[PDB]
Amino acid sequence: APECGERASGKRCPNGKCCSQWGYCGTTDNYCGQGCQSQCDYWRCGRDFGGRLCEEDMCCSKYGWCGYSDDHCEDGCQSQCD
Template structure:
């Protein structure tokens, strides 16, 4: 009986640990603690299966509405406005906007103004975006117009997120 009780307690501890390590859309937008990466399946970890941008990254959307806001980073309270708000209008208009949440690549000010090529894993639709903001969901928050541009089959809208690959590219 003692071994059965010990096994049951161990199993319950494992289940509680596994449940607490969920993240992303599967867990209501929860982020991973201790700088762990959130996989495309909604689990926290540190290996390439969790952190590699070529293994899938959850992408949601945000209503920056840059055209309606005059391409003004201050008007949308973008994190990068401190450094990039005074860039020429043509620079701010050239690419769609995104918030970058990692898991791989520079973060904070070092990511501001950099560009990503984002590829929808299901349809292979691609777009180049400029990082103007930061986020904490372990993926990307594309401007809604950019999200719609690569959501060519409508599944992203239906699910509330897309699975994408991204890579840093020259702007």
């Protein structure tokens, strides 16, 4: 049964996860993409997003995306770079 969204009385997902248009929590494009009901910016971080820190100990790249690659953790990384 739905764990978030309108069929869950506006309930939000834990750890900032995206609530899909179908009412479930997750982090792939099916959850965070078009139709996403809430917390759709799970993968964004840094200066352009209220200085939010990434979950899962991910680095916040200079472009404001969360990840583990050298591109997200090296050169311009905003937080949790190591």
